[PDB]
Amino acid sequence: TKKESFEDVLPSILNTITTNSELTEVPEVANWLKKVLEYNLAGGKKARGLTTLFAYEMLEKPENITEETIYLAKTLGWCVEILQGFLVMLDDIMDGSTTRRGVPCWYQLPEVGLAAVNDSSLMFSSIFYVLHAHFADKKIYTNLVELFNESLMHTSIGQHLDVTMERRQKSDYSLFTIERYNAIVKYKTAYYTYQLPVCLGMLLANISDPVLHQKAEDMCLEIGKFFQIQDDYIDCYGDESLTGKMGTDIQEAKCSWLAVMALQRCSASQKIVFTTCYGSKEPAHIERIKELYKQLQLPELYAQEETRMYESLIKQAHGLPSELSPALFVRLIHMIYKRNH
Amino acid sequence: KKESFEDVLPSILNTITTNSELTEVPEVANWLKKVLEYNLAGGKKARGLTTLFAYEMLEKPENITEETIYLAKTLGWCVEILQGFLVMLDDIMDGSTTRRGVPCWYQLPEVGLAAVNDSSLMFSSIFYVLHAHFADKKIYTNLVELFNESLMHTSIGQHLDVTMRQKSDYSLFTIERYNAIVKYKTAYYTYQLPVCLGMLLANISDPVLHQKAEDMCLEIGKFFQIQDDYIDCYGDESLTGKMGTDIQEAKCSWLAVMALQRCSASQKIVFTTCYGSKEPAHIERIKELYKQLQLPELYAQEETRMYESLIKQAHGLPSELSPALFVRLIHMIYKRNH
């Protein structure tokens, strides 16, 4: 399969990081960074990295694809995976998370703690060594480096919206609106999850036309909103043995799609239960919220909205220029529709 | 000069917004302006000025224009942003309370550990400034690469710095370890970076000169970090702006390494009992040990020996690397008390 093929190159990417940097001189740090990367990249679906590789393979003329260009698309894909790993190492700290991919979050390890914040910077910085090593002499080099930095700025914009202590003052959830939700997910998720891997595919395929990049970006941003609404649903309703992570959105008072929809439907008395119980680590409080979500029929709303959005994305994908491969986008939509993790 | 450097700041902040997606999200643009203002306020602007001075003394006077001076200040602000980012994170790891005479950013109630996100906003800002001013210039990729390399070097050194003695085993507190720490965590971003940026703006690319410059910068950076270590213990908080934590954080500081060189058998046990403890009496007992081992007198003398060695190296540089620039830099820090 495509996944083992993508994973096959990981040991070689690790060596590239070392050999191309000052890590060559400090084996204590080179060895530590290997541990960091293996732990934080292990398991999961590799969906960002696959999306990059799939995009390239679907967008380039089959006659232009070589073994070297496939290794390059995998490498770009792995740079997205490393970005993700960096993003989630910090997210876990900010979200008060305990587990991810079925083991303790990196920062929760006793040998690590708050020094995770330095491990994140070691990870992020790795990306640029990979990009320089492979692409410094190519015309697309500056586009790649700029794209990765823009992805960091976008994501951190959205993280700010997400975690800001401003978003709620005690019983004031007046900012829990769809306008706020749409901004949060656009920036924190949709850029790095879809726009970045698709654009990397397009660049590698020598597609440069600004109009095609804008159309692809618009499609990506719609798919990423969809993807995050699923993430938010899974936080509450997912089976930990499948997701690998204990959900914290309720305890952390997040402006999740479920919270926004619950406020749409609360009676006056239900809004008081929401405001009393949301944002608390007491187990009776968390359960009261979950009960409320059930009473409000949010599971049924989710199933229907997942389908409506699915049908809308599929139509959008069908209306793209053939140069953007409607089939790529249909297949990306399909791969996530009805996921349970 | 410093105020002519500080005058450029409002245009930098304005570029950060307009050159990015921040224009669509005023909540975040406004926040980032606060982040930048608080974390860049005051201090000496030393790394920024190094960048400017390096360009002004390396470039031929006939080639400096009002426009290349503005660009040099712009790159110096990017170094100040980098330093802001680095110390934001460092203050989290070191358990610090104050910097520049106010609470460290992560210590603010509305920030906390979300300071890790504010750090990413700052880092990322750098690249928008570089794009705005340099995107169409030949040196653009070199500039973008130097900032990325500075992150990697710094983080390498920070790893060695923060990584988890074992109890009373101080066998790794050696000069070899110390030298590696301070090369990577300090010397690259504090001197090599700003000097390299000046060299690039002045169109100096010869790799032998980049090497000689780098070697000088690394020696100055070690020196600078020994002074930093000394100030952690002995500096006056009302001048430094910061409460020291090296003792309670069990750091492999210059002072600790030197204390180990001097300790009697019994002093060693005092050291291993009391170092790395937040208890005030334990901290004061380490300071009393440092005094008894004559570390203040040794620092005074070593500072002077190192200064003399630095000046002899600077005088020996090629003319095209400006011995005067290096003499000037060394004089700006010798005998500093903050």
Ligand SMILES: C[n+]1ccccc1CC(P(=O)(O)O)P(=O)(O)O
């Ligand atoms: C989806 N995402 C985007 C940006 C940063 C972190 C993540 C991770 C998720 P996750 O903790 O559920 O994996 P979020 O905290 O719910 O948004």
Ligand SMILES: C[n+]1ccccc1CC(P(=O)(O)O)P(=O)(O)O
């Ligand atoms: C000097 N430096 C280098 C890299 C990262 C942070 C610093 C800040 C210093 P500071 O906290 O004394 O200002 P260090 O923690 O003693 O090393």
Ligand SMILES: [Mg+2]
């Ligand atoms: Mg999370």
Ligand SMILES: [Mg+2]
């Ligand atoms: Mg989060």
Ligand SMILES: [Mg+2]
């Ligand atoms: Mg989630």
Ligand SMILES: [Mg+2]
């Ligand atoms: Mg510190």
Ligand SMILES: [Mg+2]
């Ligand atoms: Mg430190």
Ligand SMILES: [Mg+2]
């Ligand atoms: Mg210090």
